[PDB]
Design a protein around this ligand. Structure first.
Ligand SMILES: Nc1nc2c(ncn2[C@@H]2O[C@@H](COP(=O)(O)OP(=O)(O)OP(=O)(O)OP(=O)(O)OC[C@H]3O[C@@H](n4cnc5c(N)ncnc54)[C@H](O)[C@@H]3O)[C@H](O)[C@@H]2O)c(=O)[nH]1
Ligand SMILES: [Mg+2]
Ligand SMILES: [Zn+2]
Lengths: 94, 213, 222, 1113, 170, 57, 32
DNA sequence: GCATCCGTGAGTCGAGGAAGCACAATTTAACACTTTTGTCAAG
DNA sequence: CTTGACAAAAGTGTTAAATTGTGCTATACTGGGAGCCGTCACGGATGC
């Protein structure tokens, strides 16, 4: 099973809300090239390559780990989508 | 070889019927989804814990498997006080709660359990979270937005192949789901009253007598 | 005449048309009965309708007669020789002006189209249309490589000057229009034809130099 | 390896020719050997005598005789050139002018009749095909009880299929008998009056019954004259048509009295005579003579129906599913029927041609148009359901296919129109149709296999042989009898003990009318020839059949067909005795015609000097590709100068060892779970099998290309393919084809072809690229042939056929065709499917090294590990007994032949195991070795389990374990013994045709359909996987809305969506939001074509255009 | 019919985890072809996408780094295994692919009862979810290790089976 | 109600009833093309018969 | 071919928004 | 109230691919001739 | 940047050859041919 899957299931009132949050966070990470991560450099997921350890390119795993840390605020009608995208671009240009 | 070929032909002509019944069940309940947490309905169903056995002509405790299939993962509509334990209204019945209810019935303290069921659900184009109960795949209350209609249809239609075909078995299930009139249909009393048998060699007649009817 | 590509009632109606024509053209002064003259027109109309309406791809009446004569000759030679004749014998028997190539082409033309819904197999769950790929619309790979080629060409043209890039796009149809001739582009820029040709050649040479120094555009040539 | 044979039943007769059902019937149909004057009125000769003479009504076209010429090409030439193996058929016809009195005779060429090879299969269009016999209801008169109303019976008159309408006779509640023809019901009194029957005759014949005869008397019809009655009958049958005596009598004669249109058949006439006790002059319901109709069968049928209704003792109802009432149409009957249809069409064409155009100057050649006959024959031999593509994976496969009986086909039952009545094993199937063997699934009970000793008679009724028993002694006289004749005698069982010829058992198990009974030897009238006659060829090849459940013996027999030949195939240790007969009758091996000496032995041919001195050269079929892709080769088994007796083996055929059918390998099998690699029927094999090349086969694949003529220009097959490097063209010779012997991998070019490109301007980007690189676009493009993914091998053959070649009839517009045969040597690998004769099947899940497999105490590792849990559920105990017997043979160095139901028993296997253990442990004692400590621990554990007697010496306990078939088995990894003794033996395992190499498929992007633009299907076409309704339901149940949307739009038919998704993925971006599928657009357009306005609206009910304005004017 | 879909015969894998399946290398290469082309473009294996596709077209032209790139691609991703008929909702299950040498799919024994799949010659189909939504749905909702109880009755459906029960009982 | 009787028969787009040329040069067409051809032939024949003053039968 | 009104496509959970701490704080500071 | 004709339905994958004849109306390959460039010298 | 000479590439205008479509056959012909068949159950009208 996915690491910390029980906590992720228990943190939301519906598993599909969990899936939506994870997918949206993964796409947000992909769009900005993982520069908007809330993970410390010691917490970033790593993959083992012949050259050496590298950052995990799977955005879903990154989103799941970030949501496990608990530093992500998720819900309905938080901020306007256009304003949120503009602010995220301003903080992390891509 | 006669019996072996009969069984093979039965399976061959039964798989198609089971698949077609599954398709019907999917296509009739494709719109049923958990659409709200609670619809606020006050109706319920009283799931019976005792079956009226006719050979003894008395109420006998049903099997544990039947009670579990009829009560596990269901919301109590009314508060139930059994064996010093108070299960409040809106409490999901887990396996421990089902076993407690079974023990209470064995102690002769409760005859039927009032639970919320989809039959009494007032949600339009679907059901509610508090009426469905647990998501049996996770042993926790059903998540809002699950396609419980498709799950129900698949669950009913999956063991159709395992049912024996040889008014019994899969054809019985098919005629039950289609609400068909059985060929050897039983005779029921239209109104309540006292029964009177007038068995005669010429004709057999049964009379239901009331105050004026 | 039934069984020659047209239904019975269609043949009857076409014969009715021929009968109407015969009534129009019939003459009773010759003292011949109406059946004798009407039969010619009825069979003519039926045969014309069979020639013009018994095939999904219409074939002219003269070519239909040619195909029928070829089939009759082939059948006669087949029954005479006790085997299927080759194209040489059929062409020889048809007459002057006929060779094996013409017979083969006529037989190829006489091939009726095959239905797309013909079942294959004991079960009726397959059709010809399930085995015919669509080769008209571009495949996803083709669209992707076209987009990549367009992007790479646009990036490569950035190295060119503002005027040279515009001249090359005009001369190669990159503005979605037909490739503008040298005079058209020159009039657009107010320049003579020779200078337009010279600047286009210079820009093409510069692009060749850049491609040689980079080799980031050769794979799309195929 | 000496062969020990078990059994006590002595067969008085040998097995009949297993292919006689296909061969003798076609020999009777053709009659190409009997002289024309001695030909009987059967088959195509009967068809000729039926349709001919043709009368214009004074021109007569009469038929005198027919002959068949020599085939234009041999079988090998037809196979190589994709021709049809056929013989020219000429007919001798005479034209007689009745008025003139002149006769014109000439031989007309009717066409080509396909010929049957010696093995019993046809070669149609270069492909081997087999005509499957069809079981159907025998024509005649039947009397079935009415299910709707008890106590009443209905008579059915059934002619040959498509040879007349079925007639129904019923007793109506009013008492008036009703006749039903072509769904039209009328009073039978009218038609009976048409046959000139008076009231007195009916009163005297049918009056000795109940009120039925009184109900049959209607003065309205009886007073009517026969002519007026016939007119009224015609009016009732066909309304609207004007009442004319000539037309009415013609219609009635064609309906119930015309031999050319109504044919009851020889079987139908025989059944009618047997049932009703009458003698029909012909095969028609009525006889039209002297301008009047005479009754043939209606009156006896009505009399029998009335007597059955009354309840006379001597009359009984007929069983529709009774195998005596069901007959078999072989290849001969079906071919004769199709030839009759074609000849009727030819006669119609002649009749419509002989009445118009130069009547005085006519010849039979001009009138006769043979095209309809050839068209019908080719349609029957190509596009018919019963003409199946030959299954020749192994000789047993073809042998079974030739002996298959199908209830489906033209004029027969249908897969989903068939109930339990036709699919059940009737009591009369004993000894005629194999009960166990049938294709499980939707076709269970509809396709069966003919029994071993069963043979189809002249009339089409299956007969079985029985030994005549008179006076309590069994004689050598054998009677071949059908089910209806079988029901009249008490037939004993083949296993009844005999003291020579006298029956010794006082209580004999016998059959009476299909039911089991216990009788005395004096009451025994017939005996079974052998237990083998009840089962077909496949089931007779399963040893210890009596210990296998029928449902699993079915699978074993079916999978015996699918075993592929192996380069090191060896005969099973435990046999039944039919392997030699199967090989001999399958015509796969090569045998000497008579006594002689072998002069020359070679891998290509064998030259033999017979006693008379003549040199006979037999070519050897070498590495010929079968229909299923397997390699069929014959390996010589003789040496130069070796003397051979008549019938001796000369060359082993495919899947054979010294004339014995060898479909697999005899491998050391241990029955025990192994680390979960045996889970759910999975099989574990040792690498030692691959080391010595066991289960290694040769498979040949054929790749075909065609160079044609195109309006853009003719496609040329050449080595100079544009825009290709020398590395890709390394294996291509100067002619553009791959050199023979070159190894080809997926993506490599087999034959090089360049096709002229369509005249079209290029895209502006491509033009700019060409201008930059200064490369002028060529006029041709690569359209060569490349090896599909997952295939390849060694190119072994190249065949190039060109237009104008002798006998090569290429399709019009095709310049040439090139075929490449590439052979690959496939070894056993993970995912390949193995099986055995007892139905135990599974895919190889692990290939362990030799040092990891469990090994015997002498150091011999096991080769295959089987899961024991497959035994108790499947109830196939025969594999355990075969394993025990194989262990005994392996340690004794001998093979065994145990016939089914009479063969090796438990005491015999136990004494053989005793001898095997004696030699096995005496060898160890002689080598100077006692009992292993691990063996001692295993013996202690076993005696704790009750497997061995406590208190015995270790040698005696080991002997007891060996007698139980179990040995002390060590573990190859730990070295410690398995805590319990393990059943280790030698078992015969076959490698099935289903291999993971041919089944693995994958696809990202590929071809798409025409209309719906969805991906194609099938590995050959490189298509995607079908995501049907049930998968969509599963996705909905999971609630994976986005995944379902992707699979419906992005990955299936959203053209713009899929293109954008692919572009985003190759650019490292995320796929975009999907759009409306093309399938919904097709839906909308088709609904509009049905004049239905389908409009898609938005929240405000405004129309929404999903076509982006492309369909808006 | 869907793109990015394959099919192959299944074999039992006892060493796999409950959330893993053995995807053949060739099937993974063909199914993940666009992702593999992108990864090869990222590294030095190929100059662009067209060159990478041409390299992958011919079997003998594939180098050894292509397999490493493919292993890098499938990291974290999951594939849906399907077996017809899909009688109930667990007939399609998400597994984490593991590259294996061979041509047969390695299936975990515990899910077999859920799939109603034995190893007498069964075939299964592999589907590849593409976007972040599809991957999240497969990994969170459709994962084999996340569906341990049968939705029909609530009893466990991925439970010890024939050989496991035999050994534990013994 | 009068819309239930067709006065103008709609015609499906030809790509949904394609007449394609296979790689072998043979033409493959759907049955809808044949149905449309029959309908058009009968309609044109009716028009010609009406223009020629054909009798009532 | 639309998003089904069940599972992740249900209106109850389809409009859920995930946002980090830093961007949310920036939005609040720039708005209020 | 009941017998009867008509219409609809009956599992999923995969692997199976028979006139010519004359004559007038329409199209087009073959040339012949201006028209339009594509390129080359001249700096 | 311009100013003239050349050498094909494409378009215009006949020219008949090839192709295509319509008209016409005058002893007398005057209503079709293939089916044809092993299923059960359930709406649902269609009448008696
Ligand atoms: C002469 O008939 P054929 O067509 O040649 O039949 P075979 O070649 O003998 O069949 P097979 O499939 O190769 O192998 P088998 O029956 O031993 O099981 C192989 C496995 O596929 C699956 N499976 C089989 N049939 C299926 C069906 N109808 N629908 C769905 N799944 C089916 C089962 O999961 C079987 O367990
Ligand atoms: Mg299986
Ligand atoms: Zn509710």
């Amino acid at each position: 099973a996915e690491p910390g899957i029980d906590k992720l299931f228990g943190m939301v009132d519906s598993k599909y809300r969990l899936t939506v949050v994870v997918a949206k966070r993964a796409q947000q990470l992909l769009r900005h090239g993982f520069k908007n991560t809330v993970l410390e450099p010691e917490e970033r997921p790593k993959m083992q390559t012949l050259e050496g350890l590298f950052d995990d390119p799977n955005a879903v795993t990154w989103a799941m780990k970030e949501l496990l840390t608990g530093r992500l605020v998720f819900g309905e009608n938080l901020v306007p989508e256009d304003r949120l995208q503009k602010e995220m671009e301003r903080l992390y240009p891509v | 070889s006669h019996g072996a070929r009969k069984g093979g032909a039965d399976t061959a002509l039964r798989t198609a019927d089971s698949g077609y019944l599954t398709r019907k069940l999917v296509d009739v309940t494709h719109e049923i989804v958990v659409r709200e947490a609670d619809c606020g309905t006050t109706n319920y169903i009283s799931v019976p814990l005792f079956q009226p056995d006719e050979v003894t002509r008395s109420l006998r405790l049903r099997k544990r498997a039947d009670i579990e299939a009829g009560l596990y993962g269901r919301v109590l509509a009314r508060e139930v006080e059994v064996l010093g334990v108070r299960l409040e209204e809106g409490r999901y019945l887990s396996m421990d709660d089902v076993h407690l209810l079974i023990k209470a019935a064995e102690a002769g303290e409760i005859q039927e359990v009032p639970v919320r069921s989809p039959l009494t659900c007032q949600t339009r184009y679907g059901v509610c979270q508090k009426c469905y109960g647990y998501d049996l795949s996770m042993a926790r209350p059903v998540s809002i937005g699950e396609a419980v209609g498709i799950v129900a249809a698949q669950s009913i239609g999956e063991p159709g192949t395992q049912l024996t075909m040889r008014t019994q078995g899969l054809p019985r299930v098919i005629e039950l789901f289609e609400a068909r009139r059985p060929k050897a249909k039983a005779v029921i009393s239209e109104i309540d009253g006292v029964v009177r048998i007038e068995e005669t060699e010429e004709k057999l007649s049964v009379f239901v007598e009331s105050e004026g009817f | 005449y039934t069984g020659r590509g047209l239904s019975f009632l269609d043949l009857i109606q076409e014969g009715n048309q021929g009968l109407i024509r015969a009534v129009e053209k019939f003459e009773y002064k010759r003292r011949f009965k109406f059946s004798t003259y009407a039969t010619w027109w009825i069979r003519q109309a039926i045969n014309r309708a069979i020639a013009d309406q018994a095939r999904t791809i219409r074939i002219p009446v003269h070519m239909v007669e040619t195909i029928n004569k070829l089939s009759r000759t082939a059948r006669q030679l087949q029954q005479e020789l006790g085997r299927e004749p080759t194209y040489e014998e059929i062409a020889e028997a048809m007459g002057p002006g006929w060779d094996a190539k013409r017979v083969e082409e006529t037989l190829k033309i006489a091939q009726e189209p095959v239905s797309l819904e013909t079942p294959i197999g004991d079960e009726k769950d397959s059709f010809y249309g399930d085995f015919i790929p669509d080769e008209h619309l571009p495949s996803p790979v083709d669209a992707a490589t076209q987009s990549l080629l367009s992007e790479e060409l646009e990036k490569a043209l950035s190295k060119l000057s503002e005027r040279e890039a515009m001249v090359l796009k005009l001369r190669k149809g990159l503005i979605d229009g037909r490739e503008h001739t040298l005079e058209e582009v020159g009039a657009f820029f107010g320049v003579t034809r020779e200078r337009i040709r010279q600047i286009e050649n210079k820009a093409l040479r510069k692009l060749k130099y850049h491609e040689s120094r980079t080799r980031k555009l050769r794979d799309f040539l195929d | 390896m000496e062969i020990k044979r078990f059994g006590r039943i002595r067969e008085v007769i040998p097995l009949p020719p297993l292919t006689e059902i296909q061969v003798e019937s076609y020999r009777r149909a053709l009659q190409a050997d009997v002289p024309p004057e001695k030909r009987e009125n059967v088959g195509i000769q009967a068809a000729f005598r039926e349709t001919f003479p043709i009368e214009e009504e004074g021109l007569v076209l009469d038929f005198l005789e027919y002959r068949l010429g020599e085939p234009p090409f041999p079988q090998d030439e037809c196979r190589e050139k994709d021709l049809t193996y056929q013989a020219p058929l000429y007919a001798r016809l005479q034209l007689i002018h009745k008025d003139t009195g002149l006769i014109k005779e000439d031989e007309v060429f009717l066409g080509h009749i396909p010929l049957m090879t010696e093995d019993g299969s046809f070669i149609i269009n270069g492909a081997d095909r087999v005509i499957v016999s069809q079981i159907h209801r025998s024509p005649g008169v039947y009397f079935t009880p009415d299910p709707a109303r008890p106590g009443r019976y209905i008579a059915s008159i059934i002619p040959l299929p498509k040879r007349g309408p079925w007639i129904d006779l019923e007793v109506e509640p009013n008492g008036v008998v009703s006749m039903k023809v072509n769904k039209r019901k009328f009073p039978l009194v009218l038609l009976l009056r048409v046959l000139g029957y008076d009231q007195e005759t009916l009163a005297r014949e049918l009056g000795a019954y109940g009120e039925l005869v009184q109900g049959l008397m209607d003065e309205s019809v009886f007073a009517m004259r026969p002519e007026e009655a016939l007119i009224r009958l015609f009016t009732l049958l066909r309304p609207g048509d004007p009442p004319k005596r000539d037309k009415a009598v013609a219609y009635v004669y064609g309906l119930i009295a015309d031999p050319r249109r109504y044919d009851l058949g020889e079987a139908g006439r025989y059944k009618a005579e047997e049932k009703l006790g009458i003698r029909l002059s012909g095969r028609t319901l009525a006889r039209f003579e002297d301008g009047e109709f005479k009754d043939e069968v209606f009156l006896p049928t009505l009399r029998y129906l009335f007597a059955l209704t009354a309840g006379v003792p001597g009359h009984e109802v007929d069983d529709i599913d009774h195998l005596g009432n069901r007959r078999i149409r072989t290849v001969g009957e079906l071919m004769t029927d199709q030839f009759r249809v074609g000849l009727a069409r030819l006669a119609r064409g002649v009749r419509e041609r002989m009445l118009m155009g130069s009547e005085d100057s006519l010849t039979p050649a001009k009138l006769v148009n043979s095209r309809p006959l050839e068209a019908a024959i080719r349609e029957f031999f190509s596009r018919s359901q019963l003409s199946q593509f030959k299954d020749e994976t192994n000789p047993l496969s073809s042998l079974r296919h030739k002996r298959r009986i199908s209830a489906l086909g033209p004029g027969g039952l249908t897969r989903e129109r068939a109930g339990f009545d036709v699919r059940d094993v009737h009591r009369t199937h004993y000894g005629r149709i194999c009960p166990v063997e049938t294709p499980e699934g939707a076709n269970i009970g509809l396709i069966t296999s003919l029994a071993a000793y069963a043979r189809v008679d002249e009339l089409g009724f299956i007969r079985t042989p029985y030994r005549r028993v008179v006076g309590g002694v069994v004689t050598d006289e054998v009677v071949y009898m059908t089910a209806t004749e079988e029901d009249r005698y008490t037939i004993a069982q083949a296993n009844t003990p005999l003291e020579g010829n006298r029956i010794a058992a006082e209580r004999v198990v016998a059959r009476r009318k299909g039911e089991p009974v216990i009788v005395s030897p004096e009451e025994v009238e017939f005996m079974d020839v052998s237990p083998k006659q009840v089962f077909s060829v496949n089931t007779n090849l399963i040893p210890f059949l009596e210990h296998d459940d029928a449902n699993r013996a079915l699978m074993g027999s079916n999978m015996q067909t699918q075993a592929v030949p192996l380069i090191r195939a060896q005969a099973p240790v435990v046999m039944t005795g039919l392997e030699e007969r199967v090989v001999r009758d399958s015509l796969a091996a090569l045998y000497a015609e008579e006594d002689g000496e072998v002069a020359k032995v070679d891998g290509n041919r064998i030259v033999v000097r017979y006693e008379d001195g003549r040199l006979v050269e037999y070519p050897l079929r070498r590495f010929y590709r079968s229909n299923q892709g397997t390699a069929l080769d014959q390996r010589p088994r003789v040496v130069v100068g070796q003397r051979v007796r008549k019938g001796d083996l000369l060359a082993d055929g495919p899947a054979s060892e010294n004339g014995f059918l060898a479909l697999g390998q005899n491998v050391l099998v241990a029955i025990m779970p192994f680390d979960g690699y045996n889970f759910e029927d999975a099989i574990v094999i040792s690498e030692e099998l691959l080391k010595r090349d066991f289960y290694t086969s040769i498979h040949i694949e054929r790749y075909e290309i065609e160079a044609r003529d195109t309006k853009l220009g003719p496609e040329r097959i050449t080595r100079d393919i544009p825009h290709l490097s020398e590395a890709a063209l390394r294996d291509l010779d100067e002619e553009g084809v791959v050199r023979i012997g070159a190894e080809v991998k997926p993506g490599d070019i087999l034959v090089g072809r360049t096709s002229f490109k369509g005249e079209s301007e290029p895209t502006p980007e491509e033009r700019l690229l060409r201008s930059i690189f200064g490369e002028k676009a060529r006029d041709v493009k690569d359209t060569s042939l490349r090896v599909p993914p997952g295939e390849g091998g060694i190119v072994v053959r190249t065949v190039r056929l060109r237009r104008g070649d002798p006998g090569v009839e290429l399709k019009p517009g095709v310049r040439e065709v090139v075929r490449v045969y590439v052979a690959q040597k496939r070894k056993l690998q993970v995912g390949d499917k193995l099986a055995n004769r007892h139905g135990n099947k599974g895919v190889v899940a692990k290939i362990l090294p030799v040092e990891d497999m469990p090994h015997l105490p002498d150091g011999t590792p096991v080769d295959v590990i089987l899961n024991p849990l497959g035994v108790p559920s499947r109830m196939n105990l025969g594999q355990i007994l075969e394993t025990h017997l194989g262990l005994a043979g392996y340690f004794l160095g001998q093979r065994y032949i145990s016939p089914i139901f009479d063969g090796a028993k438990e005491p015999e296997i136990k004494e053989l195991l005793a001898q095997a253990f004696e030699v096995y442990f005496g060898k160890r004692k002689g080598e100077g070795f006692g009992v292993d400590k691990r063996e001692v621990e295993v013996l202690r554990r076993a005696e704790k389990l009750g497997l061995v007697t406590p208190g015995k010496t270790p040698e005696e306990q080991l002997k007891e374990l060996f007698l139980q078939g179990k040995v002390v088995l060590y573990d190859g990894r730990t070295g410690e013994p398995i805590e319990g003794p393990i059943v280790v033996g030698q078992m015969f395992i076959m490698k099935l045709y289903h291999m993971v190499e041919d089944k693995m498929h994958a696809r990202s992007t590929g071809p798409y359909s025409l209309i719906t633009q969805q991906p194609l299907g099938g590995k050959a076409q490189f298509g995607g996987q079908r995501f049907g309704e049930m998968e969509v339901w599963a996705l909905e149940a999971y609630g994976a809305a986005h995944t379902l949307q992707e699979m419906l739009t992005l990955k299936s038919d959203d053209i713009e969506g899929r293109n954008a998704a692919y572009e985003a993925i190759i650019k490292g971006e995320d796929v975009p939001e999907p759009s409306v599928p093309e399938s919904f657009r097709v839906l909308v357009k088709e609904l509009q074509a049905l004049a239905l306005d389908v409009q898609t609206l938005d929240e405000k009910d405004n129309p929404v255009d999903i076509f982006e304005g492309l369909a808006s004017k | 019919r869907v793109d990015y879909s394959g099919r192959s015969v299944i074999v039992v894998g006892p060493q796999l985890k409950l959330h893993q399946c053995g995807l053949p290398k060739r099937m993974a290469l063909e199914l993940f072809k666009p992702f593999l082309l992108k990864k090869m473009e990222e590294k030095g294996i190929a100059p662009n996408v067209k060159a990478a596709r041409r390299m992958l077209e011919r079997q003998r032209d594939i180098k050894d780094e292509v397999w490493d790139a493919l292993e890098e691609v499938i990291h974290g991703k999951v594939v849906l295994l399907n077996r017809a008929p899909t009688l109930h909702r667990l007939g399609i299950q998400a597994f984490q692919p593991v590259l294996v040498e061979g041509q047969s799919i390695q299936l975990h024994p515990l899910v077999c009862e859920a799939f109603n799949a034995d190893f007498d010659g069964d075939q299964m189909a592999v589907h590849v979810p593409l976007s972040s939504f599809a991957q999240a749905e497969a990994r969170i909702q459709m994962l084999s290790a996340h569906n341990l109880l049968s939705p029909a009755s609530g009893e466990p459906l991925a439970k010890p089976s024939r050989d496991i029960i035999l050994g534990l009982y013994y | 109600p009068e819309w239930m009787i067709l006065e103008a028969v709609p015609v499906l787009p030809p790509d949904l009833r394609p007449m394609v040329q296979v790689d072998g040069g043979r033409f493959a067409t759907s049955d809808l093309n044949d149905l449309y051809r029959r309908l058009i032939n009968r309609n044109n024949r009716l028009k010609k018969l009406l223009a020629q003053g054909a009798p009532e039968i | 071919g639309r998003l089904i009104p069940a599972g992740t496509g249900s209106d109850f959970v389809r409009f859920t928004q995930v946002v980090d701490q830093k961007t949310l704080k920036a939005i609040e500071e720039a708005r209020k």
